[PDB]
Amino acid sequence: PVIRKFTKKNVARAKKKYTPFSKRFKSIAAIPD
DNA sequence: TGGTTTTTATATGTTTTGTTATGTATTGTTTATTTTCCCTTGACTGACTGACTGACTGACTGACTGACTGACTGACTGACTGTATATA
């Protein structure tokens, strides 16, 4: 029923992440080398 | 435990509105010069109206005039009173 007011389909979205490394150890002691 | 949905970050697209610099044309600024009729300056012109010359008829003193009024005085008529006259 809805209509998008303007289309982007030839987009090529890149599979790249927004979570930095700062948020996959969660502590100073929690980090490997 | 385990699969699914909802929101968000990044990335891009869309549209409206407002900012700044500029080159060309119009018009203003200053200064010098000539013409136009409005506004001062003034004698001429025409009616005006103050002092001087005429004048005109009502007011108070000159009392006047003349009839009338007021005191005096004699004339006269009525009331008072004596001389007189008559009778017992």
Coordinates of C-alpha atoms (C1' of nucleotides) in Angstrom, one line a residue:
Chain A
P1 CA 0.0 0.0 0.0
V2 CA 2.7 2.5 0.9
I3 CA 4.9 4.1 -1.8
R4 CA 8.5 5.1 -1.3
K5 CA 9.0 8.7 -2.5
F6 CA 12.2 7.9 -4.3
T7 CA 14.2 4.7 -4.9
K8 CA 17.8 3.6 -4.5
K9 CA 18.3 -0.1 -5.7
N10 CA 21.6 0.2 -7.5
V11 CA 23.1 0.8 -4.1
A12 CA 26.0 -1.5 -3.2
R13 CA 25.9 -1.5 0.6
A14 CA 29.3 -2.6 2.0
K15 CA 29.3 -5.3 4.7
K16 CA 31.4 -3.4 7.2
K17 CA 30.8 -3.2 10.9
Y18 CA 29.9 -0.3 13.2
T19 CA 31.0 -1.9 16.5
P20 CA 34.6 -0.8 17.2
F21 CA 37.1 -3.1 18.9
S22 CA 36.5 -1.0 22.1
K23 CA 33.4 -3.1 22.7
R24 CA 34.5 -6.7 22.3
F25 CA 36.6 -7.1 25.5
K26 CA 34.8 -4.7 27.9
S27 CA 37.7 -4.3 30.2
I28 CA 41.4 -3.4 30.4
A29 CA 42.1 -6.8 31.9
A30 CA 39.8 -8.4 29.3
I31 CA 42.1 -7.9 26.3
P32 CA 44.4 -10.4 24.5
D33 CA 47.7 -9.6 22.8
Chain B
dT1 C1' 18.2 -22.6 25.5
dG2 C1' 17.1 -20.6 20.5
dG3 C1' 15.2 -18.3 16.7
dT4 C1' 13.1 -13.5 15.2
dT5 C1' 11.9 -8.7 15.3
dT6 C1' 12.9 -3.7 16.1
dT7 C1' 15.9 0.1 16.1
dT8 C1' 20.2 2.7 14.7
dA9 C1' 24.4 4.2 12.2
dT10 C1' 26.3 5.2 7.9
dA11 C1' 25.6 6.6 3.5
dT12 C1' 23.5 8.8 0.0
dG13 C1' 19.7 11.5 -2.4
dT14 C1' 16.2 15.6 -2.7
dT15 C1' 14.5 20.2 -2.2
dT16 C1' 14.0 24.8 -0.5
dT17 C1' 16.0 29.1 1.1
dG18 C1' 19.5 32.5 2.0
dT19 C1' 24.6 34.7 1.4
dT20 C1' 28.3 37.3 -1.1
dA21 C1' 30.7 39.7 -4.9
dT22 C1' 30.3 42.2 -9.1
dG23 C1' 29.8 45.2 -13.6
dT24 C1' 26.8 48.6 -15.9
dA25 C1' 23.4 52.4 -16.0
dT26 C1' 21.1 56.1 -13.7
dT27 C1' 21.3 59.9 -11.0
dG28 C1' 23.4 63.0 -7.5
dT29 C1' 27.3 66.9 -6.2
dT30 C1' 29.8 71.0 -6.8
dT31 C1' 30.4 75.3 -9.4
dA32 C1' 29.4 79.1 -12.8
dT33 C1' 25.8 81.8 -15.8
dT34 C1' 21.2 83.9 -17.7
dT35 C1' 16.2 84.7 -17.7
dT36 C1' 11.2 85.7 -15.1
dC37 C1' 7.8 87.7 -13.4
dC38 C1' 6.4 88.6 -8.1
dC39 C1' 7.2 92.4 -4.6
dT40 C1' 9.1 97.0 -3.1
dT41 C1' 9.1 102.1 -4.0
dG42 C1' 6.4 106.1 -5.4
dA43 C1' 3.9 109.8 -7.6
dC44 C1' -0.9 110.5 -9.3
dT45 C1' -6.1 110.5 -8.3
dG46 C1' -10.3 110.6 -6.3
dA47 C1' -13.6 110.9 -2.4
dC48 C1' -13.5 112.4 2.5
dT49 C1' -14.7 115.2 6.4
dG50 C1' -12.9 118.9 10.8
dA51 C1' -12.9 124.1 11.8
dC52 C1' -15.1 128.2 10.2
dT53 C1' -19.3 130.5 8.7
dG54 C1' -24.8 131.0 9.2
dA55 C1' -29.0 130.6 12.2
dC56 C1' -33.3 129.5 14.7
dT57 C1' -36.3 128.7 18.0
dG58 C1' -37.2 127.6 22.9
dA59 C1' -36.1 129.5 28.1
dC60 C1' -36.0 132.9 32.8
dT61 C1' -36.4 138.1 34.2
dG62 C1' -38.8 143.2 32.8
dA63 C1' -42.8 142.5 35.9
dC64 C1' -47.7 144.1 33.5
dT65 C1' -52.5 144.0 33.6
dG66 C1' -56.6 144.2 35.5
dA67 C1' -60.1 142.1 37.9
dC68 C1' -61.0 140.9 42.4
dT69 C1' -60.7 140.9 47.1
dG70 C1' -60.3 143.0 51.8
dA71 C1' -60.9 146.7 55.7
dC72 C1' -63.3 151.1 56.7
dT73 C1' -67.1 153.8 57.0
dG74 C1' -71.8 155.7 56.7
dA75 C1' -77.0 154.5 55.8
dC76 C1' -80.6 152.4 57.1
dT77 C1' -84.1 149.4 59.3
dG78 C1' -85.5 146.7 63.0
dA79 C1' -85.9 146.1 68.0
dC80 C1' -86.1 148.5 72.4
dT81 C1' -88.1 151.7 75.2
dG82 C1' -90.0 156.2 76.9
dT83 C1' -93.8 159.9 76.4
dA84 C1' -98.1 159.9 76.3
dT85 C1' -103.3 159.4 76.9
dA86 C1' -107.7 157.5 78.8
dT87 C1' -110.8 155.6 82.4
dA88 C1' -112.3 154.4 87.3

